[PDB]
Design a protein around this ligand. Structure first.
Ligand code: SF4
Ligand code: SF4
Ligand code: FES
Ligand code: FES
Ligand code: FE
Ligand code: FE
Lengths: 633, 633
């Protein structure tokens, strides 16, 4: 079981699933093997009905696609489409929040409101929206309008790109034609240019892809901005993670997917429904999180993280999960089948996201609270059906300190320097106490023993005094192995990093250090890491490609993670990916993405499947940036 | 050679290519075989880095994707993405024309103008744009603005859907949530919903796909509307088709791709450059068309069609093609390699469409004429380099009558009935002289002997008195085999259809019938067929799904043709496809697309690879509609 997941609760549930004859993601992976080498390497094209066209990586024919598409054209086109798909996911999330804010301030969705006035004003100033003497509702209406305008061509480029990066970075990108014109515009242009008989130049295609990845970044930053306005900017919180946060005595309700728009209401309403839960014979309603929707409610409300990503089915194998409430993205459709065995009620709530066999509740913001009550009532009924059933919740959980928004990180730092909060951090970068910054992002992947890359790399970097921050299922991997518990600072952190975490925490009235890893939120909250890095760049007077900052999508799966890794490269970061992306079938494309893009954006991909080697390579990237600033290392 | 293409000029050039060691599309197809059965059937998914996931059509494992995606989810998601890609091609074409018109009437692109005042006013009235007392330039500015607005969400749905179909059809579509909200919005939503862990219900996915196909229809209709405003509505023209329209003594210049924005200027400017061509020792400049850009200039100016689609390389094998001038879509990138052997200068002109090894001229409307001159000068230089070279142009061409816009068809009919032009057509439908209407659309496909399906089906339908109209490479196939020469009416048409073609032509001062097939233009001009069918529906008082009208993508290749076939189904037509689309790996998806969609939109796919059988099935669909109207058959 240890080759499947390094998570001991996951291993326990894998034993139970095996016992009970429930097929898992790892079983389905095993039945897939051996997987197709054309597709693994990127050398397959299905973009027209003359295909499929495969190209042998090595050897004889086929060597070229039927229309004459070369290996590097086919590889570049497939990669571009995955970037567009990731952009469309982060785009749709952000767009739905933009409409939600619009409805709220126009009197049409009373369940929603401006919860963060300060964030709303900051964003409007960053956008050029006049706030002086304006009502909050009108400012927010203008912010929502600008959000929706960034999806199409207009007078200006995508403002959630050009106003969030430092002017020098915008200038580098703009000299290369990389600034997106509109988010959905770029997505559509990708799909056009990659379709048969269109763009057939690897460099041209990849440049289009860098621009589309910045449209993805715009969607991420928009989604973060709007969720913060709507639901509050995260501040440090204490909670728990892993399957042990389920309670046999409670109605256990998982919020799963990505968009917090429904699940924030779920969290607020379940408090009122606790009495009706008690009448059903439960102790109450226990909301737990899965994947990024769980990260959102953990970040803002301290909702305990139940599990993530590849292991999501295991939450249901316990037999104690009464409801799993879905919006969209990264939901294994297998859940709808597994429910018939485990008694879980699986509830879809989004029109564009249905799963055959799952109960659908047609959620609308205009009636959010009522939908919430309905959904929770289904959960309560499900609990009633397992009164007296045996469950098996692994008694395994970790302590998680989280809520490290960029505003929270700055506020924490400001207790060491009120007028210049970034300076203590920069000071300790310069004197070597902090060697660099590494952002862990992205998913788990069934091909990698769950969490093994995240924790192996994290461990080596923390011993080398790297400040580690994390999002998404990277943050989930680290939280489930204790990397967010301050009690583990002694064991995990080098002396200089330990000193800095301890100074900041003890100056923030925690009596102890910050946790070993800083949890910066959901996958769209990778934008927060951008906000931090851009701030450091502005404070130092240098472009982002001169900072000792790296990223690692150590166990990447989703097309969103490919989009994210590509924009990390495009804004100038050495960007590791710990799973094989479909580019090895073309050496020229590989050379562009790992070497020559350095001369365009200053960032580059680091493809490395061995996590020890990957940690070495990330240390080398950090230290080369250090040397480029004339710092010791 | 006859198993490759039924075109005798193509066969001659295939002999020459074989002689000279130039690899062709058919050779590359042969080296691809045997092709992958997972991909052919649709049972492959690469939408995340846990894949590729294949599902065996029959037998043992793998039976399910790694995330639990079933065969019908995988099939529906792949089909939806191809519909979005086709939508993005027709979308990008239309968008570029919309910007071109905007620039023209704002004083920024003097090479462009309002060439069709009547079309501009008609379109504005159809859209609700006020024209009374407005300057033409301001009306056109409003029309361009509305065009660009249809790409994103706004107060209204996509007007190039809701104002071009009869109200009853809009009502049927709208009851099913099928009306697009914005063109690029729908494309992005497809890419979101089909990405990993999102929509996993075959019916939900396919409904999303029908809506996206209507976004494709909107792009098509927009592109037709705007090109007609900018360059003139086609009226009947006489010209020629096939390779024999090349002349050894001239500078031979192919316009190839889809968007007429550059190539219309090429046509106008080459007239002025004829003297400079003569000074180079040529007789002049001979512009010829390939694919849909060629269809555009054939439709408006009578430019001879040189070849189409699968056989495009053969135009260069002659050795007499001095320049091939590309915008985007359906260009085999092989041309850029083949040029090094044939001496042709291959010129790309679009930023999102480059081919390694091809000369790029950065075309801008603001300087169109100057770009045109530059491009033509390159052609002239190329001619100079083959002074005295032997060429081999097959002396094979057909006579083509074309230019049958819907306005032209109505004007022709109006000579039989001035006040009620649709009535003579309807009369002859009712008395059986016209059994029905069949639209031939779409590409050639290397898997089908070139043109064999188009001509076999056309022949059987014409003998049965079907009015046949055609677009795109379907029109190209029929024109190259004489189906657009009125001299062949006697041989090809049944007596009743012959009678109708003869009455209309003799009443239009042609001294003979209309040609056997009516050429309605490029692939976006499939919208013209919609305009005709909607008009017939409005004139009869019935929805489109009650009319004896069918469509045939007899040799479909491109994702655009899949989008087109899907919207033909969505607006209510029996819609044949003569190539295997990637849906056979899922029986439920096949059942939806060929049977149960009848109960939603009234149309349905007819999948049939045998063209004799397909003709029978199209006759049966037509006659079942006839019976449903209570007509004899
Ligand atoms: S676009 Fe080219 S490479 Fe792709 S499937 Fe079609 S013929 Fe093959
Ligand atoms: S989305 Fe599902 S079926 Fe597709 S590649 Fe990923 S795991 Fe396999
Ligand atoms: S040949 Fe296997 S991915 Fe296409
Ligand atoms: S397995 Fe061949 S198309 Fe993917
Ligand atoms: Fe996740
Ligand atoms: Fe074509």
């Amino acid at each position: 079981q240890n080759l499947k997941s390094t998570d001991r609760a996951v291993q326990q549930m894998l034993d139970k699933a095996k016992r009970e004859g429930i097929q898992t993601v790892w079983d389905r992976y095993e039945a897939m093997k051996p997987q197709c080498g054309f597709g693994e390497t990127g050398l397959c094209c299905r973009h027209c009905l003359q295909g499929p066209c495969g190209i042998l990586p090595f050897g004889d024919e086929p060597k070229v696609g039927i229309c004459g598409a070369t290996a590097e054209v086919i590889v570049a086109r497939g990669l571009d489409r995955s970037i567009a798909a990731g952009a469309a996911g982060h785009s749709g999330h952000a767009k739905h929040l933009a409409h939600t804010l619009k409805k709220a301030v126009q009197g049409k969705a009373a369940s929603y409101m401006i919860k963060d006035r300060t964030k709303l004003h900051s964003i409007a100033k960053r956008l050029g929206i006049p706030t002086e003497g304006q009502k909050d509702e009108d400012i927010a209406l203008e912010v929502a309008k600008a959000a929706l305008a960034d999806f199409h061509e207009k007078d200006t480029p995508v403002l959630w790109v050009t106003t969030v990066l430092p002017p020098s970075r915008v200038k580098v990108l703009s000299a290369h034609g990389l600034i997106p014109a509109g988010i959905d515009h770029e997505i559509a242009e990708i799909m056009h240019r990659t379709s048969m008989g269109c763009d057939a130049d690897a460099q041209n295609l990849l440049l289009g892809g860098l621009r589309c990845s910045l449209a993805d970044l715009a969607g991420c930053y928009m989604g973060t901005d709007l969720a913060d306005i709507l639901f509050g900017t995260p501040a440090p919180v204490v909670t728990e993670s892993n399957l042990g946060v389920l309670k046999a005595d409670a109605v256990n309700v998982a919020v799963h997917g990505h968009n917090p728009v429904l699940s924030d209401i779920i969290v607020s309403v379940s408090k009122e429904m606790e009495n009706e839960a008690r009448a059903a014979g439960a102790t109450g309603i226990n909301v737990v999180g899965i994947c990024c929707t769980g990260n959102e409610v953990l970040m803002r409300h301290g909702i305990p993280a139940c599990t993530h990503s590849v292991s999501q089915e295991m939450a249901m194998i316990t037999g104690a999960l009464d409801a799993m409430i879905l919006d969209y993205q990264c939901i294994q459709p297998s859940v709808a089948t597994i429910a018939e065995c485990t008694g879980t009620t699986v509830i879809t709530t989004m029109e564009m996201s249905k799963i055959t066999g799952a109960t659908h509740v047609n959620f609308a913001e205009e009636a959010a609270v009522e939908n919430a009550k309905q959904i929770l009532r289904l959960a309560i009924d499900t609990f009633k059906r397992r009164k007296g059933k045996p469950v098996e919740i692994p008694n395994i959980k970790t302590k998680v300190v989280a809520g490290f928004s960029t505003e929270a990180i700055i506020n924490a730092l400001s207790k060491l320097n009120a007028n210049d909060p970034l300076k203590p951090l920069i000071d300790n970068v310069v004197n070597g106490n902090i060697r660099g910054v590494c952002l862990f992002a992205g998913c788990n992947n069934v091909k990698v023993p769950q969490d093994q890359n995240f924790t192996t790399i994290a461990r080596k970097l923390l011993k080398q005094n790297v400040l580690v921050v994390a999002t998404g299922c990277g943050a989930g991997a680290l939280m489930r192995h204790g990397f967010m518990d301050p009690a583990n600072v002694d064991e995990l952190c080098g002396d200089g990093l330990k000193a800095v975490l301890t100074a900041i925490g003890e100056a923030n009235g925690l009596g102890g250090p910050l946790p070993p890893v800083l949890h910066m939120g959901s996958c769209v909250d990778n934008s927060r890491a951008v906000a931090l890095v851009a701030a450091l760049a502005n404070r130092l007077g240098v472009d982002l490609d001169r900072l000792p900052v790296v990223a690692s999508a150590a166990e990447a799966m989703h097309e969103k993670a490919v989009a994210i890794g590509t924009w990390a490269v495009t804004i100038g970061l050495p960007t590791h990916i710990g799973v094989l992306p479909p580019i090895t079938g073309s050496l020229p494309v590989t050379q562009i993405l790992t070497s020559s893009v350095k001369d365009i954006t200053g960032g580059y991909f680091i493809v490395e499947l061995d996590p020890e080697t990957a940690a070495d390579k990330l240390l080398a990237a950090i230290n080369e940036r250090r040397a480029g600033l004339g710092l010791p290392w």
